[PDB]
Amino acid sequence: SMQEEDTFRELRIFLRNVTHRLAIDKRFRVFTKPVDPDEVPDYRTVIKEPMDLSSVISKIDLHKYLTVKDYLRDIDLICSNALEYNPDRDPGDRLIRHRACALRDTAYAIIKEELDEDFEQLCEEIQESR
């Protein structure tokens, strides 16, 4: 229905706003663009599904997310990839893991305060019907 298409458009507007607020935070600059395969040739041999905030914007615009649950799977993937690729005790690895956990926690906190639970339940019921 037109009403259902209006629901998914409101979801996309919400998701672009949350993603922009993450992408402008100085702590999360390392997560804003894909890892450059020229500068880090071993990245794609270790990390099987790369993800970053510019790719998340592209996916919103391609209508890849029909629920906030869908979207948070990709935020969780940015975080898990950082913990996997950078597991050591040295300061550079510990700084990127701290920033990855902050990105995940910040996304979940914005959604807790600003996503209506009945809006999410409506998106999940339309997705299930298709």
- Report yes or no: 68 and 15 within 8 Å, Cβ to Cβ: yes
Reduced DSSP (H G I as helix, E B as strand, rest coil) percent helix, strand, coil of the chain, to 5: 75, 0, 25
- Between residue 37 and residue 66, which ones bind ligand GWA under the rule CB under 6 A? 39-40
By CB under 6 A, which span of 11-19, 59-67, 82-90, 111-119 interacts with ligand GWA? 82-90
Q: In this chain, which of 22, 51, 82, 123 binds ligand GWA, going by CB under 6 A?
A: 82
- Report yes or no: 127 and 67 within 8 Å, Cβ to Cβ: yes
- Between residue 23 and residue 42, which ones bind ligand GWA under the rule CB under 6 A? 30, 35-36, 39-40
Matching residue, tokens 């809006």: 119
| For ligand GWA, the closer CB: 67 or 81 | 81
Nearest residue to the partner ligand GWA, using Cβ: 39
**Residues in Cβ contact with 39 at an 8 Å cutoff, skipping those fewer than 6 apart:** none
Interacting residues with ligand GWA (CB under 6 A): 30, 35-36, 39-40, 82, 85-86, 96
